[PDB]
Amino acid sequence: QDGGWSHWSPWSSCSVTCGDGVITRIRLCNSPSPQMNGKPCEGEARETKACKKDACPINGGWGPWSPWDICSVTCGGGVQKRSRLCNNPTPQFGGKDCVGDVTENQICNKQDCP
Ligand SMILES: *[C@@H]1O[C@@H](C)[C@@H](O)[C@@H](O)[C@@H]1O
Ligand SMILES: *[C@@H]1O[C@@H](C)[C@@H](O)[C@@H](O)[C@@H]1O
């Protein structure tokens, strides 16, 4: 017998909770099922349409550490500092801040003086 399409399914929810997603619905060649000697169902069994929502949060990335500062002293124990920025990338769309220190300090030229 000739194939026959069911009614469509409901649309799924949007595939994604932010950014550009998709919604799907499906139909079966069962109304009736092409039993034998018969023409199939005409068209595709699935529609995918697009769904679009607000931009996905962009979490903070650490950019690269500054070259160390020059040591506070040429001998007998000093400090040097370096720094970094949360802008690789910058937190966007309620994305999370970077985790860890903006700064580092370390000893340098601990070698006893003449
Ligand atoms: C679903 O909810 C949205 C708001 C964001 O938190 C997404 O990362 C998540 O997939
Ligand atoms: C840097 O070099 C060391 C060895 C000493 O000469 C210091 O007094 C100087 O500033």
Residue numbers in the entry: 434 to 547
The authors write:
Thrombospondin type-1 repeats (TSRs) are small protein motifs containing six conserved cysteines forming three disulfide bonds that can be modified with an O-linked fucose. Protein O-fucosyltransferase 2 (POFUT2) catalyzes the addition of O-fucose to TSRs containing the appropriate consensus sequence, and the O-fucose modification can be elongated to a Glucose-Fucose disaccharide with the addition of glucose by β3-glucosyltransferase (B3GLCT). In addition, POFUT2 is localized to the endoplasmic reticulum (ER) and only modifies folded TSRs, stabilizing their structures. Here, we conducted molecular dynamics (MD) simulations and provide crystallographic and NMR evidence that the Glucose-Fucose disaccharide interacts with specific amino acids in the TSR3 domain in thrombospondin-1 that are within proximity to the O-fucosylation modification site resulting in protection of a nearby disulfide bond.
Interestingly, we observed a continuous electron density between the fucose from TSR2 and the two cysteines (Cys451 and Cys489) that form the C2-C6 disulfide bond near the O-fucose site. This electron density suggested a stabilizing hydrophobic interaction between the O-fucose atoms and the disulfide bond. The electron density between the O-fucose and disulfide bond from TSR3 was not continuous but the same hydrophobic interaction between the disulfide bridge and the O-fucose moiety was kept. In both cases, the hydroxyl groups of the fucose on TSR2 and TSR3 were pointing away from the disulfide bond and exposed to the solvent, allowing the more hydrophobic face of the O-fucose to interact with the C2-C6 disulfide bond. Interestingly, the O-fucose residues in the previously published structure also covered the C2-C6 disulfide bonds, but the fucose was flipped. Although our MD simulation used the previously described crystal structure as the template, the orientation of the fucose moiety in both TSRs was the same as in Figure 1B, suggesting that the conformation of the fucose moiety in our crystal structure adopts the most stable orientation and is likely a more reliable conformation. Using MD simulations, X-ray crystallography, and NMR, we showed that the O-fucose covers the C2-C6 disulfide bond of TSR3, protecting it from reduction. The orientation of the O-fucose is mediated by interactions with the side chains of several underlying amino acids.
